[PDB]
Amino acid sequence: RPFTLPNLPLSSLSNSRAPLPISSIGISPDNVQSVQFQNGRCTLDGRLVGTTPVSLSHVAKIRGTSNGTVINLTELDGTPFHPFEGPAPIGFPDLGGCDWHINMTQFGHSSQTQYDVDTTPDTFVPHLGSIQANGIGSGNYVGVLSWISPPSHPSGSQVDLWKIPNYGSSITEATHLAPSVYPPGFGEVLVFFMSKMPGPGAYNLPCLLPQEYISHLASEQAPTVGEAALLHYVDPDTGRNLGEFKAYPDGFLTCVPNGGPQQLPINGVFVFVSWVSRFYQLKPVGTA
């Protein structure tokens, strides 16, 4: 059975770093070359890496018990979390460069509570299982990311969703992060799937793969994966090819702009064409 990607239009799919619809395709700003996202990471043969879960019902969520001073984290199903397992429990938010506002609810209790998370202080150590409670009263909670705002520290800094948070006790501590993703060359640019994120600005959250691609690849467990997969981005009504793309084994897409992808409509489908060599040269998007 040949390799496949989901036969679904991009605009019907979700971001893999928060539970938000995809609204556009984009590229990184020119002061960003590599990224190191911890959610939305899955290889073409179905290996989840970082904190990535199979399902969106786990994405950008936390679970833990507050004692009024700290929240001691668990996995989302209540299973214990230990530092050797990763930088944070599976599905923990990976949005650097902002304050988080997490909606906290409880099994067996009424009400919801907004939990305000600054990810910069020394008390923010999810790799060791603990984050500051910041006024959340004692109890067990499940929280989902709801909206974001500029970081509290350093003052005057802006929202920057190309970053990841400081999961460890310091910037030097080893937290078992998923490795960085780098542009591969050949004039190719990394492709990101973008979602609008609520909050006091025009926030756009990038990810490397839609969440439904992750569950697809994890199910498919491709027995054979070549050096790179040649894709066409196809308009499903006319069947027209809107542009050539490559997908790489580590789980990201590229194209050659002109341009691009920022201008492409979001109602297309990515279709596997064939395995090509890593250095296969793409026609610039739109061309011809």
Ligand X SMILES: C[C@@H]1O[C@@H](O[C@H]2[C@H](O[C@H]3[C@H](O)[C@@H](O)[C@@H](O)O[C@@H]3CO)O[C@H](CO)[C@H](O)[C@@H]2O)[C@@H](O)[C@H](O)[C@@H]1O
Which residues of this protein are in contact with ligand X, per CB under 6 A? 99, 101, 110-111, 116, 149-150, 152
Q: Could you tell me the two tokens for 157?
A: 């800094």
**Residue 219's binding partner, choosing from its own copies, ligand X, Na ion, none, with beta-carbon cut-off 5 to 8 A by kind?**
its own copies
Residue 19 CA to chain centroid, in angstroms? 10
Q: How many CA atoms lie within 13 A of 213 on its CB side?
A: 32
What is the x/- site pattern for its own copies, positions 95-114, by CB under 8 A?
Answer: ------x-x-xxxxxxxx-x
76 binds its own copies (CB under 8 A): yes
218 binds its own copies (CB under 8 A): yes
List 96, 212, 251, 255, residue binding its own copies (CB under 8 A):
212
Among residues 113, 133, 116, 126, the alpha carbon closest in space to that of 67 is found at 133
Burial of 263 (0-12, 13-18, 19+ CB in 10 A): exposed
Q: Could you tell me the two tokens for 194?
A: 């973008």
Residues that bind Na ion (CB under 5 A): 124, 166
Among residues 279, 244, 280, the alpha carbon closest in space to that of 261 is found at 244
What's the sign of the alpha-carbon dihedral 108, 109, 113, 116?
negative
Whose Cβ is closer to its own copies: residue 41's or residue 58's? 58
Q: How far is the CB of 40 from Na ion (least distance, A)?
A: 21
Give the binding site for its own copies (CB under 8 A): 1, 6-8, 11-15, 19-21, 23, 53-58, 76-77, 101, 103, 105-112, 114, 142, 144, 146-147, 149, 196, 198-202, 211-212, 215-216, 218-221
